[PDB]
Enzyme design. Structure first.
Site, PDB file in Angstrom:
ATOM      1  N   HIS A 137       0.804  -1.216   0.000  1.00 55.28           N
ATOM      2  CA  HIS A 137       0.000   0.000   0.000  1.00 55.28           C
ATOM      3  C   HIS A 137       0.839   1.269   0.000  1.00 55.28           C
ATOM      4  O   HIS A 137       0.383   2.312  -0.486  1.00 55.28           O
ATOM      5  CB  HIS A 137      -0.931   0.003   1.205  1.00 55.28           C
ATOM      6  CG  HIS A 137      -1.893  -1.133   1.191  1.00 55.28           C
ATOM      7  ND1 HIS A 137      -2.751  -1.353   0.135  1.00 55.28           N
ATOM      8  CD2 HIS A 137      -2.106  -2.140   2.067  1.00 55.28           C
ATOM      9  CE1 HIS A 137      -3.474  -2.430   0.376  1.00 55.28           C
ATOM     10  NE2 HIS A 137      -3.106  -2.924   1.544  1.00 55.28           N
ATOM     11  N   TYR A 307      -4.256 -12.321   8.659  1.00 56.61           N
ATOM     12  CA  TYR A 307      -4.648 -11.901   9.994  1.00 56.61           C
ATOM     13  C   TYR A 307      -5.308 -12.967  10.837  1.00 56.61           C
ATOM     14  O   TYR A 307      -5.422 -12.769  12.048  1.00 56.61           O
ATOM     15  CB  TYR A 307      -5.577 -10.690   9.906  1.00 56.61           C
ATOM     16  CG  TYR A 307      -4.888  -9.617   9.145  1.00 56.61           C
ATOM     17  CD1 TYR A 307      -3.839  -8.916   9.716  1.00 56.61           C
ATOM     18  CD2 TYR A 307      -5.218  -9.361   7.824  1.00 56.61           C
ATOM     19  CE1 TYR A 307      -3.165  -7.963   9.012  1.00 56.61           C
ATOM     20  CE2 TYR A 307      -4.550  -8.398   7.105  1.00 56.61           C
ATOM     21  CZ  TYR A 307      -3.518  -7.704   7.704  1.00 56.61           C
ATOM     22  OH  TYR A 307      -2.836  -6.737   6.996  1.00 56.61           O
TER      23      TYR A 307
HETATM   24  O1  LIG Z   1      -3.980  -6.510   4.415  1.00 53.83           O
HETATM   25  C1  LIG Z   1      -3.682  -5.371   4.512  1.00 53.83           C
HETATM   26  C2  LIG Z   1      -4.305  -4.518   5.650  1.00 53.83           C
HETATM   27  C3  LIG Z   1      -5.069  -3.582   5.134  1.00 53.83           C
HETATM   28  C4  LIG Z   1      -5.799  -2.663   6.142  1.00 53.83           C
HETATM   29  C5  LIG Z   1      -6.610  -1.754   5.370  1.00 53.83           C
HETATM   30  C6  LIG Z   1      -7.453  -0.827   6.256  1.00 53.83           C
HETATM   31  N1  LIG Z   1      -8.286  -1.569   7.154  1.00 53.83           N
HETATM   32  C7  LIG Z   1      -8.813  -0.791   7.925  1.00 53.83           C
HETATM   33  C8  LIG Z   1     -10.334  -1.076   7.981  1.00 53.83           C
HETATM   34  C9  LIG Z   1     -11.153   0.140   8.437  1.00 53.83           C
HETATM   35  C10 LIG Z   1     -11.312   1.351   7.748  1.00 53.83           C
HETATM   36  N2  LIG Z   1     -12.114   2.136   8.511  1.00 53.83           N
HETATM   37  C11 LIG Z   1     -12.475   1.478   9.660  1.00 53.83           C
HETATM   38  C12 LIG Z   1     -13.289   1.839  10.788  1.00 53.83           C
HETATM   39  C13 LIG Z   1     -13.481   0.928  11.848  1.00 53.83           C
HETATM   40  C14 LIG Z   1     -12.871  -0.357  11.809  1.00 53.83           C
HETATM   41  C15 LIG Z   1     -12.071  -0.719  10.706  1.00 53.83           C
HETATM   42  C16 LIG Z   1     -11.873   0.210   9.625  1.00 53.83           C
HETATM   43  C17 LIG Z   1      -7.587  -2.618   7.872  1.00 53.83           C
HETATM   44  C18 LIG Z   1      -6.632  -3.468   7.018  1.00 53.83           C
HETATM   45  N3  LIG Z   1      -2.796  -4.818   3.559  1.00 53.83           N
HETATM   46  O2  LIG Z   1      -2.273  -5.639   2.512  1.00 53.83           O
HETATM   47 ZN   LIG Z   2      -4.146  -7.355   2.530  1.00 49.69          ZN
END
Ligand SMILES: O=C(/C=C/C1CCN(CCc2c[nH]c3ccccc23)CC1)NO
Ligand SMILES: [Zn+2]
Ligand SMILES: [K+]
Ligand SMILES: [K+]
Length: 638
Positions: A137, A307
């Protein structure tokens, strides 16, 4: 030639963690790293890999892909307290910083270059880096989605700079779109980026319009970015495999990459709370396997997401198992991709048809949570048994062997009185060899596959096949290059017959697949398109217990035979018996080498004849109702 597999890991990269409450970030834990390494040590796999020390990416190296301003800002985070580190993290989307994350980010980065250096210097064939934080990312001047620096982007930029590489394939099978990688290479035709990802019509994170299938690259790089959005959750092995056979592999084998980098996130595995897909850990053993014939096997797998600590461990092992060449698990229950997946697959293929020759026919209408524990994967004592003609001795790899007990010798006489008469006392030795080799493959985990040289085809095929069925082997897949009919009944659903001939033969039923490719210059590309888009999808759904390869004494496909032999070992846990009619030192050297698990020589990139693609699509039309994994369009309702 290179041997072995690197494993790059260091407990230090688990020494940063989230320090305030934030449910966005609550899932990215140090235990992901230690659970993954501990699963590899528990299964014997770590011990089988060359440990390679981690290092720090230098400042010059980080600046390959990131701006000085952003590097300077991150350099200050080790001086920050928890209030200041929270303020710094809130400027970025879904990322937390820690006193020690800059350190670990340089370790995750350097570890990836360590892996690139070991593979490109021929010190190992391939390898994996278990790293934290993830990379894909990360962007030129921003942290994003737990990523600080773009490890995989580093690897490709670094392999470009230091090894004069022209073509690099990046495969991103994480469940999230690797948009930092895309941004970095969207104008670069030397890096092909493939990413599948949970999209849900842009309602899933990172909610980007560019994550959609219509982002193909920009400028000189159009056609070297491929996005495959999943617009529903719950994708299965058949969806993932359908993505590989009909989108990724056709494109990858034509690109002919000099190196393959995998952004291996296992949040696309069953049980993961971020991806919510349904693909079994075993699928990654096949995702890895189907890519290993690219680039002479030069493959660097870099850990990204994952995860669910349990599925995480199992998918890591299935990946390293395939990197070490262990036999792949059988995948049962395959069929058609779901309608949402077929829509996504169909839409990518159509937009990409301007750029790739496997899809070019589409452009003109002239021719348009708990799941079972995976089984054990032990490498055979002897991987490959070889039976050359009498008295011929060859240079065999260290994991091959030459091959008749009295048990077996009574059986050949038993069979001879009943069904043959025949007395040619060495084609009677061939059937002693066939049986004793088959007995070693099936009754034992100590021999995996084998190659036998034979002189009489129909007697040899009959006993090979009948001795395999009455053994029992539930199903037998037979792959035959030549003409004429053999003593093979496609009667029940116990045999499927792939035939590669020169005279055109009308097919009747859906348990035989006959490919008459026009002979000439385009014979090599046509065979590969059929292998990737017809043979592999049917073979995988058929799920044979044994694969029987048969080559008639006739040359023209000495260039493609090793690729098929390697790819087809994804079926039947690798148990494949090949019968070569006549002696050809080089065809036999080549078969044994692919069966032994050696590296496959690349083909290079000449487009297939349109008459051949017409022929292959008529075969898809004819078989895709019985064999759904052949589908790469949505079917029409009544
Ligand atoms: O696997 C990966 C990990 C990527 C991450 C990407 C972003 N989310 C966040 C999720 C999220 C956005 N707003 C929220 C509000 C409340 C609870 C949760 C969220 C987690 C994983 N990268 O390769
Ligand atoms: Zn991922
Ligand atoms: K991805
Ligand atoms: K690109």
């Amino acid at each position: 030639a290179a041997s072995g597999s690197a494993l790059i890991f260091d407990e230090e990269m688990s020494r940063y963690k989230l320090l305030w409450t934030d449910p966005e970030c609550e899932i990215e834990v140090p235990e992901r790293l230690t659970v993954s390494y501990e699963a590899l040590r528990t299964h014997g796999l770590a011990q089988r890999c060359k440990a390679v020390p981690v290092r720090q990416a230098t400042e010059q190296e980080i600046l390959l892909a990131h701006s000085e301003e952003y590097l300077e800002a991150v350099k200050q985070t080790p001086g920050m307290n928890v209030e200041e580190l929270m303020a710094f993290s809130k400027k970025y989307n879904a990322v937390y910083f820690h006193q020690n994350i800059y350190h670990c980010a340089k370790l995750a980065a350097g570890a990836t270059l360590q892996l690139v250096d070991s593979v490109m210097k021929r010190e190992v064939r391939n390898g994996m880096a278990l790293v934290r934080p993830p990379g894909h990312h990360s962007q030129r001047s921003a942290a994003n989605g737990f990523c600080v620096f773009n490890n995989v982007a580093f690897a490709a930029l670094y392999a470009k700079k230091n090894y004069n590489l022209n073509r690099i394939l990046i495969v991103d099978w994480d469940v999230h779109h690797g948009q930092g990688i895309q941004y970095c290479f969207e104008e670069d035709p030397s890096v092909l980026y493939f990413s599948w990802h949970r999209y849900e019509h842009q309602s899933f994170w990172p909610n980007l319009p560019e994550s959609d299938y219509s982002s193909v690259g920009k400028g000189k790089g159009s056609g070297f970015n491929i996005n495959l959005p999943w617009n529903k959750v719950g994708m299965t092995n058949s969806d993932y495999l359908a993505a590989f056979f009909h989108v990724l592999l056709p494109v990858a084998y034509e690109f002919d990459p000099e190196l393959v980098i995998v952004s291996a996130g296992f949040d696309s595995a069953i049980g993961d709370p971020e991806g919510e897909m349904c693909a079994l850990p075993e699928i990654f053993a096949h995702l890895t396997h189907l890519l290993m014939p690219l680039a002479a096997g030069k493959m660097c797998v870099v850990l990204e997401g994952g995860y669910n600590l349990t599925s995480l461990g199992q998918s890591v092992c299935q990946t390293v198992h395939s990197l070490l060449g262990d036999p792949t698990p059988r995948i049962s229950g395959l069929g058609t991709a779901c309608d949402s997946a077929l829509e996504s697959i169909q839409n990518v293929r159509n937009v990409q048809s301007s750029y790739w020759s496997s899809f070019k026919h589409l452009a003109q209408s002239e021719t348009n949570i708990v799941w079972p524990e995976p089984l054990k994967r032990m490498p055979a004592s002897v991987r490959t048994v070889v039976v050359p003609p009498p008295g011929v001795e060859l240079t065999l790899p260290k994991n091959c062997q030459h091959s008749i007990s009295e048990s077996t010798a009574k059986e050949v006489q038993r069979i001879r009185d009943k069904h043959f008469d025949l007395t040619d006392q060495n084609i009677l030795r061939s059937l002693g060899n066939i049986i004793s080799v088959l007995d070693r493959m099936m009754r034992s985990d100590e021999v995996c596959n084998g190659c036998v040289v034979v002189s009489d085809l129909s007697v040899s095929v009959q006993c090979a096949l009948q001795h395999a069925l009455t053994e029992p082997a539930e199903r037998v897949l037979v792959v035959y290059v030549g003409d004429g009919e053999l003593p093979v009944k496609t009667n029940d659903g116990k045999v499927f017959l792939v035939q590669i001939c020169t005279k055109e033969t009308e097919d009747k039923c859906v348990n035989r697949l006959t490919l008459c490719l026009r002979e000439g210059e385009s014979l090599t590309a046509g065979f590969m398109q059929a292998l990737l888009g017809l043979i592999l999808p049917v073979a995988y759904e058929f799920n044979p217990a044994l694969v029987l390869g048969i080559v008639e004494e006739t040359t023209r496909l000495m260039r493609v035979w090793g690729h098929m032999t390697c790819l087809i070992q994804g079926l039947a846990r690798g148990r494949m018996l090949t019968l070569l009619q006549g002696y050809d030192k080089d065809l036999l050297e080549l078969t044994v080498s692919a069966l032994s698990g050696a590296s496959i020589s690349p083909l290079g990139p000449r487009a297939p004849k349109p008459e051949d693609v017409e022929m292959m699509e008529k075969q898809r039309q004819r078989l895709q109702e019985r064999w759904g994994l052949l589908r790469c369009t949505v079917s029409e309702s009544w």
